[model samples]
Target chain A: MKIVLVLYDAGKHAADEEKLYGCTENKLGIANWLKDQGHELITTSDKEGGNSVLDQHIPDADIIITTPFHPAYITKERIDKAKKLKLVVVAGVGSDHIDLDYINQTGKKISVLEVTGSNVVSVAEHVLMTMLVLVRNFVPAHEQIINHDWEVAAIAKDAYDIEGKTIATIGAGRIGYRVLERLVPFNPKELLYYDYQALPKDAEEKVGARRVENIEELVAQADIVTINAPLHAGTKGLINKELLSKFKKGAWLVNTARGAICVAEDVAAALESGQLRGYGGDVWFPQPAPKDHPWRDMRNKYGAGNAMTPHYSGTTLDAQTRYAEGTKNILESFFTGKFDYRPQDIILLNGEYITK
Target chain B: MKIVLVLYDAGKHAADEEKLYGCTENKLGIANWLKDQGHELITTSDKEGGNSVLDQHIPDADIIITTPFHPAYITKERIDKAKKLKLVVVAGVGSDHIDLDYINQTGKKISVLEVTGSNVVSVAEHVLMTMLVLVRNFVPAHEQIINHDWEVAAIAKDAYDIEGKTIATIGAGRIGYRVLERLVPFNPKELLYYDYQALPKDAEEKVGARRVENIEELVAQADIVTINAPLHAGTKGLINKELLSKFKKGAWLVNTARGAICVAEDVAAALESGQLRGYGGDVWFPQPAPKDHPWRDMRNKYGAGNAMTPHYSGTTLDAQTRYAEGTKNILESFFTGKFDYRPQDIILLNGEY
Candidate 1:
């Protein structure tokens, strides 16, 4: 069996740090085991273009693995070319990079799975960090120190405490619910969440969060809105110009879910027009956002409130260990012919989709 | 009565933001009231030099007010010069900028007080933000984006989750205890504190924190050490080189207390040597830290983990409102001859030589 792995390049970190198992050099720590098992293991950081190693191996690869951090976007064309592919593994969460509809429509038995719940805590932590970083006006303040300038009023004029502000999450799932739990201690005035279904009474009481049925009402009432819903046909481009119009003036928005969930141009416009006080998150439309991605430089009139980072929130060292071990476990199950997989990890199996 | 207020300059923000009472131009929002009461009110951001307005007003000022954000250092010489001085008010928390010993040693009737508990919550929020910013390696990651560079591994290799790390606070006062409460949700492995006295059992149990009698033991066991103790004689230079050596290697240190509590040079040296992974806080030894202050451009070997900011954490727009009102209330008590000051605001009152 031939397996192809696409991961972010760790550069010098791969050799110096033995625990960077998710990087290309380390190959999720499964290279040796697969090699010893007499299976061919191919790993590469090159996933773009027709000549890339991932593209070259798609036709004959028995299984292909990728990560959301640096996804080898398996589009319909690539999926069609992957003639021998039996399984597509997501080393981390969020399989939006792959076209799930193609797998179902074509009636292909190619199973799509991910290490569920492995990085929810990591991503939740990132959401909080990004929220605080934006509301507190930390980046520009730190920049002032590095530049040897001390202007208290310049930064303090716009800085705010999260206390007593209305905060809302677009989806109340593993990552969003954790974000709500963590924010309860900050003493927000209100916590609102918009989802198709209501949370259990006990869970809602635990965080003191209210359920808002409409996304419009959620954004209109929120001082800060965080997007945690998965990227799907319904969610793609959900936060466009009209949705942003409904947001409170000068409200902050965070999206670690997926970049396409929000229209990139509209977000930049909202930031420029001061409709949104700040915009932050790790996910972007393309994995390696072109150097000129507007979010990289977008800011409010005050030259503050841009907290974009490469997508590494859900791939922290602590999370990498969990997902790496999870990837190994799933592969072991496949190799041993047990065909027994954790139900939560299965996104699609036997031409049936599982909604998590 | 003559009242002199020294505060940071707000520049254009002064006109745009009405809540900025801590700035020189706004004067704690007490100017109109003081002037209406037939008292002279002098406000200035110029506090550093002998030719400044504060120095000019020292001779006959009946009362003086200053803020920790931009303090006018009231030394023994200035106190001696203020023959008519009666009261000194801190517009915000922390009176370390004033010479407390001089107030006591001279047996002067001059009273020193602050708006206690006004900005504790604000400062506590800053402590948590600094901890997250340092541990997650946020600055470098954000910098990578602004510079149009994409290096996930470069940032991820150093980025960390605050969970499961042992965190300790040097003092468990309003700010420190609140820091502990805020961190509880992060689910730290253990929370430790060092103080001269133990907290009440209920208060201690509220945050699930353990008190350590020795500072050495606290730092040794902590992956993160936050300085929340007041800077007094006993803690003037508490975190010196020798004490820093006892800290767990690569531990992050946050000082939202006074900058003078730690030897500035020693912190920079530790960061350079990697003894400390990061050093962050809003406080510096002197207001308007010189352009060459070592912390302005200090970093660990990975070029990550410096989260320093100008002294504005306690003076956020939200905090400015609370402290400003608190300052007004204190003055109202002093002016009406009632002297019904909140006991917590008083640091020194009567003096007899």
Candidate 2:
């Protein structure tokens, strides 16, 4: 089987991370292990444009592996040319970049599967980090020491203890529940959540969280709101300006789920007007948020609140190892002709979308 | 009786904090509360030079107030000059700046006291922040996003989960035990602590912490070390060159206790050589570390590993309210001729040394 893998180029600063770990697209990364299995492997960081190496290899590829970090946007246009492609594997979770609707509706039976539950802990931990960073006013406080200036009152003006704040998550799924579970120890004022359906009995009881049926009520009551639901038709642009205005003034928002889940410009404006204290998460709208991305420079009237980063919360090395193992296991099942894949990993199977 | 308050200048930047608060010498800060009691109040942010306002008022003042944030180093020479100085009150904790031996040995009866347990929670919370900041590689990661550059590889090279790391505190007292207690939820590999005396059985059981008899063994085994011990003759320069060498390589250290406890130059060298992964705390050798301080720019090989802050783990608004009230209560007790201060708050009572 011919395979094509799209991952980021670690560049010169790759340092200790250049070695082939999990799904990263370094010289010694994902390509080598698959190639060792006697499958023809072509890996490229050049995932953009029509003349890209990914385009050159996809026509003959039997299985294509990609990551959310540097995804190969498998639009219907690209799917038209891939006559031999049978399977699409996402080495990491969140396969939104693939046009799942178009692929399943096409005559060709292309299957989509991802390594689910791979990076939930990594992202959950990052959520806590970002939450504490904003509440503690860590970035600017640390900056004062770096700039050789120490202004206690200046930094302490906005700095606050996170112990008494009310926290709520938009979704109480794997990552969201984990965030609340970890948060229980910090002793927040309350733990509330909003979800389309009820959480599992065990999860609901374990988090000791109150469920808010209305999204508007959840936003209005929470001191900090986090986005953790999957990105889909329903959730896309969920936190627009209207919803943002409903949020308790100066409340913080964290979204490690997906960037498009939020309207970037609306979040930036909220930060500007003091309606939102800060917006922090490791996800961005376009992967590699353009230099001029509003979130990159958005600060409150105090001039230091934005805490944006590239989509790396879920790509920690520890998480990368687990997903890489799951990726290889999925390929082994496919090549053996057993078709024994974990049911939860399948997003689209046999030309039918498995999830909404 | 007259009182003199030596405090920090909150200036125009005081914006919201200008009103009466802790030891801040801004308008209506520490001095106003004492003046409200009918005693004359003299407050000044200038306490450094002999020609400053503090020296101008020290001779006639019956009580003097200072804060750890901007302490007036009341030395033996100053003690000789303050003929009428009866009591020295520390608005916050840590009274190492005042010369204890000379002030007491001076032929007059002067007492030194501080508001104990005023901000242990605040300092403990900041310790957790510093630990997470260093082990998770928070500073560099935040810097990457701020610099408008995203280098996942650079940040991930040092980034790690705090779980399963052995954490130990140098002094398992109010601040240290609280740090260990708060850290219990993070699921560390082990919790250990070293102190001159055994921790109370209940305190140890509550925190599930192990007691290390030897400080050297504690440092060698801990992945992260926090200083919480008081600064006395024995503890000054406790974590010097030899002590830093004994620490586990790549161990992170947090010092919210006192900067004088650790040798600053030795710590800078350890960070440079990667013997220490990172060092973070609000305390500095001198409260306001000079602009050219070595710790300001020290970095590990990865180009990011310093989480120092200007002595602020304790001065949160919540903490300020507590210490300010404690300061006022201490003065009220003195004015009523009760000397009914909290016994724990008194350091040297009726000094006869």
Candidate 3:
């Protein structure tokens, strides 16, 4: 009785491989122990063409694994080809790379699971840092440092004190709620959040953040806007051009949720002008984004900042260990016919069942 | 009673002086408004030598005013000359430029006062910005923007996340406490402060900061060191080479306190050899610091992050108004027989009886 593992690329593997060739070591270190457990694990960092290992193994894979850092874009075409695929697991919190609508239509018993709290601490910290980075004008000062100039007067002219501004977050999950909780101590003028189910009174009292009945109203009032909801049919395209127009002029927006949640072109345009002061996130629509992505070159003269990264904050060295262990627990429950899924990851209409 | 203001040099008269170049014009603005109440205002932007109006009327002048930005360095020798000098006010905060010891010995009952809290908010915010600029290694990243290099990996390597480090602030007074309060939301691993006075538990718990009794303990324990103490006999020349050795190797230090608080040469040495990660502040030993101060030309191969400013944080447009008004209020109280002294400005030994 052997289970086929598609690819188990861990924390540092993708980031390291991008620079120097033939180095496949990861930060979280889960693969060596898996090999020791006597499971049949097939590991390859390639996800490109007809001759790739991903294409060769899909017909036989029992369990599939991917990461937000270097995700495999599993389109509906690829799902149709996976004749033996039973479970699809994402090592990080966000699972937007796989088309969720297609998964619900296939009747494949597909569940997208992740180690939920693994990245919350770091990502929340990143959100706080982004708030200061955009509000405090850190990017330009940082730019001046890289230039070897000391123009304190020039930097101070546009920079401001960020004590009194309203901050709003769009999802009240663990990560979003924590970001709000941490921001509470700073004494923002006001805090606002939007979610499908309202949080308990204790949660609301913890941060003093108001629950906005309408998500659109939250965006319009925010001086600093953060996106924290999961990506799904309801939230994937919420930040289109028209929705962004609701924002305060020269406000900030951040999304560590998923890159696809935004129309990238809209964000770049809003930032180019002064409509949005800055937009920062570690997530992008496609992992290993093409070099010419519009955000890479988005320019603004009057205090505009862009801090997009390749989605590694959620899978830091510490996060990989927790999720990698959780993945094994999920597999044990499923194989013995008592598949008790992790409570935190209950996205309804999941994986090939909604239509079938 | 007419009193001549010595320095009107802040630029409001000749320039737009958005920084409020002179209390709206020669900073005797309140006095001018009071002139309608039968008082007089003699103002001057001329900050030159003897021929200036400042000296022309020093004999009959009821009051003397000066600013740290463009100070009239009234020496002990000069203090003896101004016989009618019943009051001397250091317009902003620091009054070290005057002869404090002479004020005590002369038995003239002259008072030296400043408008405190006027610059507290602006100074506290500048200190926070300087701390992050040094710890996160911000200067090098800004250098890249001008250099036109896009090596993201190089910048991120030395550039670090500041959440998991021990941070200590020396002398947690008004500005220091504000700095610690801002740092609380960052969730630093630990926050330690060394001040002569131990704060009440309420003040301690307010910012989640612990009290370190000795400066040496703070130096050894912290990854980031901030000096916010006053410059006095007990604390002057605090960060010299000998004491700097006690700090954890590669630690960062920022001083917005006073220029004489550091040796300058030792700071330059520590920065050059990578013993200290960076040095930052907006203070210099003397106003109009000569163009040849060693720090002005100091930059290491890595070009360590040093955000030295020209002492403008306390003189920002908003701060100038509060302090300038406080200075005039000090004069009005004295001229009207109300000798009230602001609590924060009593830094020297005054004599009586």
TM-scores of chain B, in order: 0.93, 0.93, 0.89
Cα lDDT for residue A163, candidate 1: 88
Q: What proportion of the real contacts between chains A and B does each prediction keep?
A: 0.73, 0.44, 0.03
lDDT of 1 by residue, B201-252 (tens): 9999988999998999899989999999987798998988999999999899
Clashing pairs in 1: none
RMSD of candidate 1 to the truth, in angstroms, is 2.4
Model 1 - which docking category?
medium
How does residue A209 of candidate 3 score in lDDT? 80
Selected candidate, larger TM-score, 2 vs 3: 2
TM-score of 2: 0.89
Model 2, B72-114: lDDT tens digits are 9888988988888889998888787899988777657888888
Best by lDDT: 1
Candidate 1 residue-wise lDDT, A1-356, digit = tens:
99999998898988867788889899888888999999999999899899999989999999999998888998999988989999999998878788888899878989888999898988898999899889988888999999989888989888888888999999999999999988988899999999988999999999999999899989999999999998878899999999999999999999999889989999999999999989998889866789998888889989987989888898788889988999998888888999688889998885468665
- Evaluation by lDDT, superior candidate among 2 and 3: 2
Highest TM-score among the candidates is held by which one? 1
Q: CA shift at A222, candidate 1, in angstroms?
A: 2.3
Query: DockQ-based ranking, best first?
Result: 1, 2, 3
B1-353 per-residue lDDT for model 3 (tens digits)? 66666654433232433445344254545654657657566677564677767677677765677777667766776677776777677778777678777777877766777777766666776776676656655555444433444333333333444567798998899888878887776668898999889877998998888998788888998988888888889888888998888889878888888888899898888878776877877777754455666666565546655766566666654556676678767766676776666666654423331
